């Protein structure tokens, strides 16, 4: 599983999960 | 699975989810 | 399952679920 | 199953499903 | 499972899920 | 203002000529909140 | 402001000229807050 | 400003020339707060 | 200001020239707080 | 200012001029304050 970001101004989530419970990348 | 991500200007969620039970990627 | 995303100004999801259960990319 | 997204200026959601169950990339 | 990040000027998250159970990458 | 998000802009007094384009050339964007 | 998030921005007095373009060229943003 | 967070920007008497642009030439952004 | 992040920029009384171009020229980014 | 993070930049009375570009060339940053 490749992952590729290119973020120029961010100000929030991406990749990033919130209030989860099991997580895999 | 391949993940590309080109943000400009970024304030809210791309690839996150939330609340959520078992997540994977 | 390829993912691309070019987001100029993002100010809510994208490819985020909210309130789910079992989730899966 | 190949996602592809151009987003310019987004307030809502794209491919962010809410208050589901089983979800399913 | 590679990882690439460009990131311009991040405010935010990127690949850093909060509020989760068991995370691995 | 008072306890109040009252972002704010302002374009005046400019010129912009063009020949060619393909993308926007003016729009800027106000928001006042995000909430998520 | 009091107590307020009052972003702003101003341009005033220019000139742009352009002959081709593929993206933007005046495209400011402005966010009084931004909530997660 | 008093309690404030009030950020602000100004651009004013430029002139901006440009032959041929493939991303943003004037798209600064402004944000008064950003809460994560 | 008074208990106030007061962020400020300014541009002004400025040329740009550009003839070829793949990325921003002109993105200053002003941001009054960052909470995480 | 009192009691305030009132970060502040200028740029005034100048002139760039480029041929090809790539990256940024002007995009200052200016943040009040980064609490994390």
Not at 9 to 25: K, R
């Amino acid at each position: 599983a490749n992952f590729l970001v290119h973020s120029s101004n961010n100000f929030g989530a991406i990749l990033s999960p919130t209030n989860v419970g099991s997580n895999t990348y």
